[PDB]
């Protein structure tokens, strides 16, 4: 038997619905979502850390000259100077006056401590979704975890469920994302090949242990003029540290909709937006026919003291009399009033009490105990406590959020 409805996508807040057939007693059906993750497909292109300039010991050729040919290591900057007379602790290192030349070079590679303190620049798009939801049918709780596209199925003990597309599709990540030390930022980093000195992305490398890295940090070798031998140089500030001092707050404490973000697969889990449509199929093992159901007649209700809030504050009393004795579901049909209870035992001439929560000042909602419908109404005062730690189980709907007395006055 097929059934379709639109459960709102809010984790932890269940909702109630019933199914009806011919010659079968209606049964309870509540679908609540326990967890919901939003995992996009990413693409890593390079990883960066702060540089560590390595200057090899300079080369001098006495009473001669030499040139230098380019190499492949990162930011290899070479330069030759003519007319130097190098000194060190043992003086007179060169037998030549203004004829010997020295050679200077200074490349760049990763620091030895940035196997932990590195940043990975990803590129995310087409964020998919999956959700785990509890389904209860005929007092037979079942656990499921399916995708969200309107194609992929999910089965567990004869429970076939199909979830439709989201009303509004979005992801909390922009096109370009960057991760360092387990927390996600949101930055517009340079592409793999456009390096700018003094900014993030100063060093590019596909892997942290790679052999052929590329970078440019505008090394400029100055001409030596001091007595002894030493190569002078000036260099721009490391882009990684400069961005680190100006990183801003992470996306952990900024993403909307209350999405909390895991970082190992770069998820975005447990946050609420839109409505997910469902299509649930139920077997016949949990359906009882009218020949075994208890018959209910002459339903009567009165409310004691109603209040509209997020917690179950309203109180309902249902007086009845039946023919047989057994278990009979009770459900509130209005979309602005849900019942805390799911099922209640029925007897000959009993009288049961219930609970409900509403979002409208008028608690005019119709309930049905095994199909015997009834109207039930009274006024509800606003609550004094206006700050709580529990989300509202029902949404605000116009034509009911305004009191009936106001309707009479303005009509």
């Amino acid at each position: 038997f097929e059934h379709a409805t639109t459960v709102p996508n809010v984790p932890g807040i269940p909702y109630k619905a019933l199914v009806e057939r011919a010659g079968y007693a209606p049964l309870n059906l509540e679908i609540t979502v326990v967890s919901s993750e939003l995992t996009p497909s990413t693409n890593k292109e390079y990883v960066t850390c702060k540089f560590h300039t390595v200057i090899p010991s300079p080369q001098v050729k006495c009473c001669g000259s030499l040139e230098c040919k380019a190499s492949s290591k990162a930011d290899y900057t070479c330069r030759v100077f003519g007319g130097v007379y190098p000194f060190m602790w043992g003086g007179a290192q060169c037998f030549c006056d203004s004829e010997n030349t020295q050679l200077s070079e200074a490349y760049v590679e990763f620091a030895p401590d940035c196997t932990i303190d590195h940043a990975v620049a990803l590129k995310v798009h087409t964020a998919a979704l999956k959700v785990g939801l509890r389904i209860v049918y005929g007092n037979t709780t079942a656990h499921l975890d399916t995708f969200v596209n309107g194609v992929t199925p999910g089965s567990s003990r004869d429970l076939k469920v199909i979830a439709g597309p989201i009303s509004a599709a979005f992801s909390p990540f922009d096109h370009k994302v960057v991760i360092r030390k387990g927390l996600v930022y949101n930055y517009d980093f340079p592409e793999y090949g456009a390096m700018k000195p003094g900014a993030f992305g100063d060093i590019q490398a596909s892997s942290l242990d790679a052999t052929d890295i590329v970078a440019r940090t505008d090394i400029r070798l100055l001409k030596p003029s001091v007595k002894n031998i030493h190569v002078p140089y000036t260099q721009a500030v490391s882009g990684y540290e400069m961005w680190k001092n100006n990183s801003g707050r992470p996306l952990q404490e900024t993403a909307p909709f209350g999405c909390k973000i895991e970082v190992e697969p770069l998820r975005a889990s447990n946050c609420a937006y839109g409505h997910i449509p469902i299509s649930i199929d139920i077997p016949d093992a949990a359906f009882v026919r009218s020949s075994e159901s208890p018959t209910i007649l002459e339903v009567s209700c009165t409310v004691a003291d109603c209040i509209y809030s997020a917690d179950f504050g309203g109180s309902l009393t249902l007086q009845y009399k039946a023919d047989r004795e057994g278990h009979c579901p009770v459900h509130s049909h209005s979309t602005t009033a849900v019942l805390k209870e799911a099922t209640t035992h029925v007897t000959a001439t009993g009288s049961i009490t219930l609970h409900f929560s509403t979002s409208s000042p008028q608690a005019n909602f119709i309930v049905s105990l095994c199909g015997k419908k009834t109207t039930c109404n009274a006024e509800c005062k606003p609550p004094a406590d206006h700050i709580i730690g529990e989300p509202h189980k029902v949404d605000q709907e116009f034509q009911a959020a305004v009191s009936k007395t106001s309707w009479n006055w303005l009509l």
Binding site: F87, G91, D97, K227
Partner: protein, 80 residues
């Protein structure tokens, strides 16, 4: 030389820094920056002859005279 008044002049035409004057190292080919100053001393590990010429301690009684007279090789200090 003397390409500016803040440095030193040598007859080779080379103008060297004033900080290189009388520092114990012959800098310009003329060798003029050491001719006008009061010398500090002989080194702690150096020997002083009667003429005042510092003699390295390694060059003593190695068989070859090195000082102005040969007092480094004299038997009064390192006998044969």
């Amino acid at each position: 030389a003397k390409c500016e008044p803040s440095q030193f002049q040598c007859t080779n035409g080379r103008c060297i820094t004033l900080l290189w004057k009388c520092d114990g190292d012959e800098d310009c080919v003329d060798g003029s920056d050491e001719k006008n100053c009061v010398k500090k001393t002989c080194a702690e590990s150096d020997f002083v002859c009667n003429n005042g010429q510092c003699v390295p301690s390694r060059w003593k009684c190695d068989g070859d005279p090195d000082c102005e007279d040969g007092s480094d090789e004299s038997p009064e200090q390192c006998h044969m």
